[PDB]
Amino acid sequence: MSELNALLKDINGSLTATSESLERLSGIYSNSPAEKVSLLSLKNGSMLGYINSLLMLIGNRLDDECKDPSAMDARERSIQHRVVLERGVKPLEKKLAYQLDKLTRAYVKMEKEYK
Amino acid sequence: VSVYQVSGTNVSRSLPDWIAKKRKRQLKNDLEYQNRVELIQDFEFSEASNKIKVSRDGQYCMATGTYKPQIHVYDFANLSLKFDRHTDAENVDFTILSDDWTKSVHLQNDRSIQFQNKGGLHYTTRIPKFGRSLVYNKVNCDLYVGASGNELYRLNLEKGRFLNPFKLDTEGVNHVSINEVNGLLAAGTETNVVEFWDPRSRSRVSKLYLENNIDNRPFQVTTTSFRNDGLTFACGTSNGYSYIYDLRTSEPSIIKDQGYGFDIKKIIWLDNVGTENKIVTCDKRIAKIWDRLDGKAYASMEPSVDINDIEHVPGTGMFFTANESIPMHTYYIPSLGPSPRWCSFLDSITEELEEKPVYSNYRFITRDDVKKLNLTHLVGSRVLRAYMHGFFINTELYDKVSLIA
Amino acid sequence: QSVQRDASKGYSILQQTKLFDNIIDLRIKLQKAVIAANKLPLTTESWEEAKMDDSEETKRLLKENEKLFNNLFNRLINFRIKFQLGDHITQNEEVAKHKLSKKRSLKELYQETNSLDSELKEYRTAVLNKWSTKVSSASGNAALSNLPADVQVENQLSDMSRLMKRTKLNRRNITPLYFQKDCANGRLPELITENPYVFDDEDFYRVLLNDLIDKKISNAKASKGRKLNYSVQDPIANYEAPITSGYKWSDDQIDEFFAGLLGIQIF
Amino acid sequence: VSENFLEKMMALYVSSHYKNSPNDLQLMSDAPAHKLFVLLPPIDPKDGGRIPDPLCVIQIALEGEISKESVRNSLSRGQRAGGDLIPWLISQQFQDEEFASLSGARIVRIATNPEYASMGYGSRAIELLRDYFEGKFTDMSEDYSIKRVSDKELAKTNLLKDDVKLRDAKTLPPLLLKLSEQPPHYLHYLGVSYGLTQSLHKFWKNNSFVPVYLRQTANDLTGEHTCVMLNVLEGRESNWLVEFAKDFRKRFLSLLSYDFHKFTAVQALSVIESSKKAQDLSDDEKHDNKELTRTHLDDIFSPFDLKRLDSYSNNLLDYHVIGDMIPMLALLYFGDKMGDSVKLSSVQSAILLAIGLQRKNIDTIAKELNLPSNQTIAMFAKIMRKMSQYFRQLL
Amino acid sequence: GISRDSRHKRSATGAKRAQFRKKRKFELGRQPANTKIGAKRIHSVRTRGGNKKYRALRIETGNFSWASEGISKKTRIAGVVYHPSNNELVRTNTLTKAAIVQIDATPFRQWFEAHYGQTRAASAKIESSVESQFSAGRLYACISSRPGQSGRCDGYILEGEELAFYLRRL
């Protein structure tokens, strides 16, 4: 059994597993006035884009032609998303971490009181 | 922190103590026998010890033995057994009503409460169902007896009358305890709940449901202890988890786990010794001293034999442990506090003392629990250090794997 | 009334925090694809030889791989448009709805990805500037006036070359299929251990995993006495005397304390 | 509503003080540097905005930001300007010009309800007050100045017709402001001045303040010595506090016999321990204690002294004969030149401190510590046995 | 204090008898032998005559007999599960006669494999419940000795109608 055959099967298992789990994540988001934290909303979007850039590297490599085996454009997109998450979002939410925990605790006590 | 075992068997755990007595005649020539020192004469039960407690005056102590069920009373001043008194049954729990040893009450295994005076046994009364704990409320002078059934038994000493029994939602009372600050009574139920009761009236102030995320195994409240501050409250579970609660809030401030998964037999609060923020939790194998605020372990007590009960001498750094061995063990921790007035010269021999010193620091996990947590792949790695039949892991990592599993 | 806004705000915070845990789970499942993908060939000849090893089976797997990949990424872009729509990241609602309805090709999907990244970048600049100003005012740094976070994005994005080298580092020591053959034939211009063609985000993947592990922990008949008798027992009569002093606390404090047992514009 | 709240705040403020004077009310209202903070219970929405009673009230005074030129001029002339007590006092007690320039806030008063005392409200309020000035209270919600009476209004009104009314409710800000709403002033340190007692000293010890100065003469009214104790916020330089704490320690030990001999050994140990916590705050090794060298040991003690030290460890000597070395030994040990080799218990340190530094007799120690005299002597011998062994180890 | 005399009891008619004499040595009782699981502890008791009795404070091993296989093996006692008289003894894991206990199957399992060469076939056939107990690793046994008298905790493996009845009770 060829090495490529084992590899392509592995991608097929990963892609279908991710797709089913993507189906679940989309449903809960669709299920969800409530206003979200703009920083935390951005934190979601940046790392979500990081996965697409990773998947874009998957797409560039999967193509039999491999015109861009390095996947530079996918590389750059992943870099931009990764760069912002680690050093841009993280220090700010560390400053905001104390206040965020207070509100989440504040909601939890109310929910316990209601029940 | 240096811990000294002044009295107690000094043989390996595997070797039984009764052979220490056979070799005794053989080893009498050995110099070590001449040098070894007992603190108080005649501290041994012919088979074993159940419970130990010290007088409030601090000059007397009393203990109970398996067979022939006996009640030794020892005077600290004279370093001698004041007297032995035999009982018709093995004792479960007892309290000293008087400031001295003169007055005491014993709850035996035969469903009967014994009222022992200085002269001798005074009267015997038999409760409807078997009892597991006994506590005395000084203000109202009523004895509440924990029971296997739902109801908590009430006996009033002033009137010599059995008053109505408090009714509990859940069956089985393991431990009962009273806060002298407020009068609140906490009953340790078999189910994972503690019910809090008002003494003046006859009502349940509230019921606290204990929750442990780490283990889903059902657990039973084994012990309850209040502070002289009136604010904070400790619970011992059958899973070896000790919860310290500020009673005002439902959440647990600190959860400390002992390591061997055994029940917490006793919780002692070291307020009087100095550095009030210290607490002792006692299991079958280890009694650990640790800080309420930091949770850090300060000293660990690891006797060669199973512990049945532990007691602290107020204002001093020692602990009397009722064990399954023939001799009961007396321990000394100089850093916590000084020796008493009666062991004035114990200090001089601290170098000659045994100076017993990982096991308490880390988490003991059996081989089966390793299989449950899917940690078999880590066997042989530095993460899991094998001791006896179990692999020791860090407390922080144990919560990590348990939640994932 | 302000409690309701705080509780609802906590709900929104919780919803988002769960969303990270779901998307990181998406990353975890995709991890083996990235490891596997980095092991694939790099040149046309290597791919052709890989197919020549098993022509029929490889062709079938390739067709399924293309179908699953296209279906998955189209759904991702649909989620991206909806996600960036609901969170006000994209302001043109009509255009977003039209994109969702229409079915897109691989090249068209690439156009959306370039776009969706572009609005995200604009939203990125506005959000970082806003919060960085807020924290600066909150911490008194406004009184003082430690770079702005958005400026930090510009600076380290200016340092492209350094971080590209970080990705190119081969920590796992992955060797793509027929790598030696491509090297010998000179089909790999960039190379002519750090390898440009293998992508390594192991530390970033681990850091996210350590963070995910961390949050989970922090969040985590009269005979024998069987019947009761209330009659007086003389021997125990007056066995002890009650203490007249009573509890150290006052009764009012105890009653207050038990009740707390276990739970012009003024403002 | 404001008057009722003002009464409740004054009720708590006065109760904590022994004899409060009416002058303080004018100081609270008009003094610009002062700010008021109140601890309140959770607000039930069902109560319709009814003000809850205050549990803890903190009065702070912003101090510092002093021009270096003024400090040198004031220091040279020996004249103390009004206000900014801590900036002046530490400046004179350390002659450090940079400190006066540092911005800080003095906790003028903390008051807790006597009925609710010891429950932890006083500590909890300080914790947030520390957190607030640290900036942790960032705004979560997506002006508070009042227009003054204009000069045009003043000119247009006559005495007979003048209408003096309470300011319109609309113009006024809210009585109670959320922490997030108002930005905090950038501060370097938090300072407290108080009379040193066991219960009170323990309180700031738990709140991570560091002593820097103790006043030598006892206050006549209270018989108590004033203590100034400081805390550095995160994100701000902490080196200066460590240097002051080290210097205060050396100042503290020497002065124990002079005037502080009255103090209990436990308290002197407590004061030393509070300072020692300050060095633990500093992870830097740049400033560290130096171990006693062999040459320094030789200068301090002669070889006859060391033999005399050894014999009493062997019990071949009496206690009296070794009275010579005790004060130097206490200075060296508490100076930490002894090093990690020889550590002692709290009881042992108290015994060694007093005889070495308070100069108290061994019998006096037994009474103060509620121990037998012979036990104290036995403890003292073991302490020195440890020190004798280290000297052998050094040699 | 323990006495076995019938004089203190009331008559069959219900009459309250009076004391005839002081209590005698020959009609006395001894304290209960609450044997429990643990490291072996036994002490002797001097009884009437020169005869001695052995008191089982603690015992963790016992010689249990597979009657159907006609054998006896010494096995560690795991714990008490059911006692027909009082359930408090079960809760306290007190060992007495007739108590139902759980024992290790290792020696019996090795014995079965050693003779029958099986983990001939007709003889090797055993009751399904007992084989299930082998699979579990712990065997239900009934104590046929009196630990409070002889100091022994011997027993036999439950089988057949006894096993079915005790499983139903469990």
From Swiss-Prot, chain A:
One biological process term in Gene Ontology: endonucleolytic cleavage in 5'-ETS of tricistronic rRNA transcript (SSU-rRNA, 5.8S rRNA, LSU-rRNA)
Localization annotation: Nucleus, Nucleolus
Alphabetical UniProt keywords: Acetylation, Nucleus, Ribonucleoprotein, Ribosome biogenesis, rRNA processing
GO terms under cellular component: nucleolus; small nuclear ribonucleoprotein complex; small-subunit processome; sno(s)RNA-containing ribonucleoprotein complex
N-acetylserine modified-residue sites: 2
Note from the entry: Present with 1430 molecules/cell in log phase SD medium.
Known function: Component of the U3 small nucleolar ribonucleoprotein. Required for the early cleavages at sites A0, A1 and A2 of the pre-ribosomal RNA. Participates in ribosome biogenesis.
UniProt protein name: U3 small nucleolar ribonucleoprotein protein LCP5
Full-sequence portion shown in this chain: 1 to 136 of 357
From Swiss-Prot, chain B:
Disulfide bonds: none
Gene Ontology CC: 90S preribosome; nucleolus; small-subunit processome
GO BP terms: maturation of SSU-rRNA from tricistronic rRNA transcript (SSU-rRNA, 5.8S rRNA, LSU-rRNA); ribosomal small subunit biogenesis
Coiled-coil features, chain-numbered ranges: none
WD repeat intervals: 44-84, 168-207, 216-255, 259-300, 302-341
Superkingdom of this protein's organism: Eukaryota
Keywords: Nucleus, Phosphoprotein, Repeat, Ribosome biogenesis, rRNA processing, WD repeat
Location in the cell: Nucleus, Nucleolus
Primary localisation category: nucleus
Function summary: May be involved in rRNA-processing and ribosome biosynthesis.
Subunit structure as annotated in this protein's UniProt entry: Component of the 90S pre-ribosomes.
Family: Belongs to the WD repeat NOL10/ENP2 family.
Protein name from the UniProt record: Ribosome biogenesis protein ENP2
Lineage of the organism: Eukaryota, Fungi, Dikarya, Ascomycota, Saccharomycotina
Gene: ENP2
Curated annotation (Swiss-Prot), chain C:
GO biological process: maturation of SSU-rRNA from tricistronic rRNA transcript (SSU-rRNA, 5.8S rRNA, LSU-rRNA); protein transport; rRNA processing; vesicle-mediated transport
Induction: Up-regulated during cold stress and following nutrient replenishment by dilution of cells fron exhausted to fresh minimal medium.
GO annotations of cellular component type: 90S preribosome; nucleolus; small-subunit processome
Disulphide-bridged cysteine pairs: none
Domain of life: Eukaryota
Main location: nucleus
Localization terms from the record: Nucleus, Nucleolus
Record's keyword terms, sorted: Coiled coil, ER-Golgi transport, Nucleus, Phosphoprotein, Protein transport, Transport
Family recorded in the similarity comment: Belongs to the AATF family.
Purpose of the protein: Involved in endoplasmic reticulum to Golgi transport. Involved in a protein-transport step blocked by brefeldin A, which disrupts the Golgi apparatus and its incoming protein flux. May also be involved for mass growth or cell proliferation.
Note: Present with 15400 molecules/cell in log phase SD medium.
Name the record gives this protein: Protein BFR2
Taxonomic source organism: Saccharomyces cerevisiae (strain ATCC 204508 / S288c) (Baker's yeast)
Parent-protein start and end of this portion: 167 to 533 of 534
Swiss-Prot record, chain D:
Location in or out of the cell: Nucleus, Nucleolus
Binding residues for acetyl-CoA: 110-112, 117-123, 206
Knockout consequences: Leads to a strong inhibition of 18S rRNA synthesis. Deletion results in an altered alkali-soluble beta-glucan phenotype. Heterozygous mutants show haploinsufficiency in K1 killer toxin resistance.
Domain N-acetyltransferase, chain residue ranges per copy: 38-173
Stated role: RNA cytidine acetyltransferase with specificity toward both 18S rRNA and tRNAs. Catalyzes the formation of N(4)-acetylcytidine (ac4C) at positions 1280 and 1773 in 18S rRNA. Required for early nucleolar cleavages of precursor rRNA at sites A0, A1 and A2 during 18S rRNA synthesis. Catalyzes the formation of ac4C at position 12 in serine and leucine tRNAs. Requires the tRNA-binding adapter protein TAN1 for full tRNA acetyltransferase activity but not for 18S rRNA acetylation.
Family to which the UniProt record says this protein belongs: Belongs to the RNA cytidine acetyltransferase family. NAT10 subfamily.
Subunit structure, interactors included: Interacts with TAN1. Associates with 90S pre-ribosomal particles.
Name recorded for this polypeptide: RNA cytidine acetyltransferase
